[PDB]
Amino acid sequence: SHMCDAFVGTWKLVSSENFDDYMKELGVGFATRKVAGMAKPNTIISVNGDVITLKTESTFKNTEISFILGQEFDEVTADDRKVKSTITLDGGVLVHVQKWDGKSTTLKRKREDDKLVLELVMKGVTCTRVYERA
Ligand SMILES: O=c1cc(O)ccn1Cc1ccccc1Oc1ccccc1
Numbered sequence: 067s068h069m070c071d072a073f074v075g076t077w078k079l080v081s082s083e084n085f086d087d088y089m090k091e092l093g094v095g096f097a098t099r100k101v102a103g104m105a106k107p108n109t110i111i112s113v114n115g116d117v118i119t120l121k122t123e124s125t126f127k128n129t130e131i132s133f134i135l136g137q138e139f140d141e142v143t144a145d146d147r148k149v150k151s152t153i154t155l156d157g158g159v160l161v162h163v164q165k166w167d168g169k170s171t172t173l174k175r176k177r178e179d180d181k182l183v184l185e186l187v188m189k190g191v192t193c194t195r196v197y198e199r200a
Contacts, residue, residue, distance in 0.1 A: 070113060070155060072177045077109040077197035080181075088186050088193035092171065094145045102126050102144065109182070109197055118153070 082103075089099045107124035122129040127144040133153050141151040141164065149164040162173040171188040184195040 068113065069158065070118065070160070073111045073160065073175065073182065074113055075111060076200040077111070077182050078200045079106050079108070079195060080198045081196045082193070084191060084193040085186075085195065088188055088191050089145070091188040091191045092145065092147070098145055108200060109184075 086099055086103050089102065094102065105124040105126040107122050107126075110119075110121040110123065112119045116134050117132055118135070119130065119132045121131075122144065129144050131139070131141055131151070133139050133151070136152065136154050138150055138152045141149050143149060143164070147164070147166050149166040151162060151164045153160060153162045155161070158176065160175040162175070164171050164173070169188075171186060174185045174187075176183055180198060182197040184197065186193045186195070
């Protein structure tokens with residue numbers, strides 16, 4: 067009944083490119099990068115009314131965010147950044163912006179074929195994370 071229905075479900079990571087380099091650009095330290103980089107998260111997306119929930123489950127860290135499109139919220143990220151986040155739906159792409167300490171990173175999620183593709187950008191570094199249905 068909504069366009070964002072295409073994102074709902076349970077998703078598993080199938081490939082990753084440039085995640086270590088993205089985390090370096092974020093300022094994540096060595097041990098966290100190693101552990102986080104080994105993770106194989108699942109992402110569970112649900113919608114209930116105007117509220118979207120995105121859970122991330124892994125052996126490293128489990129996260130859960132609930133939010134309304136366009137409405138800012140405070141988020142503690144898996145690497146323990148305290149950020150101010152806003153998520154919008156722009157031409158079919160979920161656009162998640164995180165701001166902290168005068169920095170910004172953007173996470174875009176889109177459906178491409180049977181995949182859910184997450185792109186994360188910090189400065190000039192782009193990481194691509196491809197998820198498939200569980
Ligand atoms: O939510 C996601 C999901 C990813 O696949 C890749 C990155 N992030 C956000 C993220 C940024 C930096 C460090 C970790 C992190 O999220 C996780 C969470 C659990 C496991 C791996 C990455």
